[PDB]
């Protein structure tokens, strides 16, 4: 399961507050493999589909508008248990519940400005990756650090 | 809500071990707004009042003497849920119980040298702010990061 | 000329050594604006054109092959004097001549593994940007830090 | 020795707004200098005109004053051997385009009008600037435990 | 109990991934006292004895082979509750269970490459210290930070 | 060439001020290979020999006494031009002349407390290595990062 992949996006607040490198560095130092990366301005149409599961929620409309309000950094990361572990590194949805050491615990205050999205499951990750990236934007490369991260 | 304030003080051990910048930087990167700051030598009289609720505890007298033994950095920080969140950033009173990622978890060993004080509630914060600062030392400024920390 | 842009690329050694976030963070903290970003595997054809001015140099062939051997992170950064200033942040071509504090001074040893490319002039930057990015990959966003970086 | 030399430093409003107060303080701490005074204040135009009196004839004087008064500043006094000259080196050239990486301005700024921090340019300026911004009872003497490991 | 000691070792993955400084720095900033340090290539015989309690486990053989595959940084740290607290800083054996903020939580993925060993009790620490170090490699020095870490 | 070695020692001030990890990390991130490491309490006799060339200087006596006053971290690092480049990373003998970005420029004030020693030439390095280390304390290991630092 070392080829598992997750979709992460730095939300517009992360770009505006200059935390892109900080966030990328946390996934690098953890040992995951970066397999796709781009800075994009997502359309409302794409974001509506990205957050389809939340269409009934009262914040859906403002969440979509906000995620479209500025650039996001879309990413795919690969490694064993990357989906679950990425969620742990990011921390709870509401930063007030995310402990220090997590991204949201260290860098945010409020649920509407919580810096980053990560897929919530392997199935969501597959859907999100296909939605945001073409297949030719996902790169296979020989990772020399693999020998020192895996048994 | 977002105008809530807490009182923090770097204790003399924090100054002596050169952790003032490190501590301030953790509150900055979290998103909170610095509204007051000074290096002072607090009197025993002020400290007796600051720690009034601990008058019956066996360590009261040495706690007061210690907090008066050297400079402290007094601070006020503003933001949503700043009192509770500041306590979480700092970690448990006893550093042995404070997880890594918190200030006391990362930087201290023993309860009598635990680097920093934060208000334990909104009501204590109001009392502590008034005790340590005059009203004209609390500054209102237009925070340009506000749009990216709050809805 | 606050709208000046430069092309930067993290070379394969930078990706392999997990210094992408570190590098991006240095440009962020300096105040420059990230306007394009992607992880790509560049073709030999593109790299031959990228390094056209070096066609007569003895290392040209291996430089092309090497830059095509693995993923690169291509970037565009915007700000006053960004081309010249980025070169200063990166440091001399030969890391042995790059002082500590620069990227190559802090992280590299030898000229062939020197982590990063930056455009050497405004004219080179224009050519390099057009070569590596389509116009719709360069984003305009309203920068909230701008008031505090520029008069 | 000259180990009791003092300098005046101020984080300018851009430094506060960009959340670089801790970063800046940390650089002076890790260098070994002793923090002897600190406060967050909103300086008046009158004080700033006097602070920058030597620049009254310069074309940017007016905008410099207005800007330094536009937001909170962190005023500081640091103590140590050669602290005035060495602080200037840590900060870097006035124009960030001339400040090398490793300096504060080299690492964190772009333009001369937004260059994060002020440091005294000489011992005499430092004495004047300290007196202008601080009362004597805001400068603290404390016994520095790291002193044995910074000095002979 | 401020003279309690623990044995820590950076495993070969920690050396290869260049995390020795990072690891040492976390113990320094916590306040503990470094009392012994060396880079060694441990023999399989020593490692078999080190991990004697795990002789029946299925991974014993590969654990021994791996710990002998490269240099290790052997260390002794001294301070109040250093054994238990070191374990907390390192995090759970399986990095998937170690929260962000811990060494394994921040830097590792899998139990077979988990960066570092720490003694699990005072008695194990005594045994491990004697096994890896001669008495004349353990140094007593006067710690100037002690006044600011201990009541 | 790439097998050149230098002797470095963190002086007692570096240990006391908790900068060992910070120092090691700078040599790691630069790309050099750690081939020996130990914490020792050097005798006055060894230090007199270490600094033999300075016997006539007025500060010789106090330099010896001071270097013997607490633990030092002795190290050997390997790589291309490591002797000269280590000196550049360390900075000028007198920290007042060492630019920010160097170890002494970032962390010290005065020549008598300047944190670290590095060999001043290849010949001094050979002498210093033999003086401080037995041959069996210098390790050969296969460095996986070498592919990304060297041609
Ligand atoms: N304004 C607002 N946004 C919310 C709230 N709950 C969730 N969100 C946003 O919706 C995104 C997705 O919600 P969810 O899938 O439950 O959480 P996540 O997996 O941690 O992002 C979050 O990342 C938030 O930005 C809420 O109560 N209010
Ligand atoms: N010496 C000593 N100080 C203690 C003890 N318990 C609490 N304190 C101190 O009392 C201060 C305030 O106590 P408390 O209200 O429990 O906690 P705090 O809000 O975590 O600071 C702490 O910050 C500690 O330094 C104890 O058993 N001994
Ligand atoms: N192997 C090798 N590579 C070189 C040499 N000179 C330059 N290069 C490579 O070619 C790249 C581009 O050369 P140039 O633009 O002169 O330098 P830059 O602007 O500092 O990158 C450098 O960054 C190196 O990767 C050399 O003498 N040998
Ligand atoms: N806008 C602008 N400000 C300037 C210029 N030259 C100097 N300054 C400002 O004047 C302040 C004090 O002047 P100076 O003594 O030259 O600089 P400093 O000692 O490095 O602060 C600087 O810190 C700048 O913010 C200039 O050409 N234009
Ligand atoms: N390869 C492998 N090693 C394991 C496994 N379980 C434990 N270990 C190793 O055993 C070492 C010591 O075992 P234990 O005391 O249970 O863990 P520790 O105290 O966290 O080191 C760990 O540090 C791991 O490297 C496993 O399932 N596979
Ligand atoms: N106290 C004192 N030590 C000095 C002086 N000049 C040199 N040293 C010390 O001598 C050591 C070795 O001498 P040198 O070769 O000049 O310096 P290094 O190679 O940078 O270590 C230095 O590391 C200093 O601590 C001086 O004027 N006074």
């Amino acid at each position: 399961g070392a080829h598992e992949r997750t979709f992460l996006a730095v939300k517009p607040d992360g770009v505006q507050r200059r935390l892109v490198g900080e966030i990328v560095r946390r996934f690098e130092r953890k040992g995951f493999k970066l397999v796709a990366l781009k800075l994009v301005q997502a359309s409302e149409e794409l974001l509506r589909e990205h957050y389809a599961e939340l269409r009934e929620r009262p914040f859906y409309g403002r969440l979509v508008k906000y995620m479209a309000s500025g650039p996001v950094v879309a990413m795919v990361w690969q490694g064993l248990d990357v989906v679950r572990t990425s969620r742990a590194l990011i921390g709870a949805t509401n930063p007030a519940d995310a402990p220090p050491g997590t991204i949201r615990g260290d860098f945010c205050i409020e649920v509407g400005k919580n810096l980053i999205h990560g897929s919530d499951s392997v199935e969501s990750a597959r859907r999100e990756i296909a939605l945001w990236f073409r297949a030719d934007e996902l790169l296979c490369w020989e990772d020399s650090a693999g020998h020192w991260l895996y048994e």
Side-chain angles (χ1 to χ4, degrees), chain A:
Chain A
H3 285 81
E4 184 178 309
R5 292 170 169 182
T6 196
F7 176 73
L8 304 186
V10 185
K11 304 188 167 174
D13 49 305
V15 175
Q16 288 278 0
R17 289 172 67 206
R18 267 58 172 194
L19 290 174
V20 176
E22 183 62 52
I23 287 162
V24 171
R25 182 164 70 83
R26 288 201 180 192
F27 287 92
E28 286 181 294
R29 79 183 180 166
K30 180 65 165 168
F32 293 127
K33 188 181 164 186
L34 180 68
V35 298
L37 179 70
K38 58 183 182 190
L39 181 78
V40 292
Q41 178 87 42
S43 71
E44 289 204 15
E45 311 88 279
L46 190 146
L47 289 166
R48 283 202 235 87
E49 177 168 1
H50 175 80
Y51 283 126
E53 298 227 47
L54 300 183
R55 267 190 165 90
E56 292 302 313
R57 296 303 266 300
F59 56 81
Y60 178 69
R62 312 192 290 294
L63 169 62
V64 167
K65 245 134 236 302
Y66 168 62
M67 283 287 292
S69 72
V72 301
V73 178
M75 293 177 287
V76 179
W77 293 87
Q78 184 178 292
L80 184 70
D81 220 355
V82 67
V83 167
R84 193 184 67 76
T85 297
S86 291
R87 296 207 54 97
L89 286 183
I90 286 169
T93 300
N94 182 353
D97 298 335
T102 66
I103 291 168
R104 290 171 177 157
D106 292 338
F107 294 114
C108 296
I109 294 169
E110 193 228 288
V111 61
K113 296 290 189 290
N114 68 355
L115 230 44
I116 185 168
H117 162 89
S119 308
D120 70 5
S121 66
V122 172
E123 313 89 286
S124 304
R126 279 194 198 99
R127 179 177 73 68
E128 289 172 2
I129 292 164
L131 174 64
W132 286 79
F133 285 98
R134 298 150 89 238
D136 65 8
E137 298 174 295
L138 294 2
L139 308 189
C140 112
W141 50 282
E142 290 283 297
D143 174 4
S144 63
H147 192 249
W148 295 114
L149 283 152
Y150 296 101
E151 187 184 357

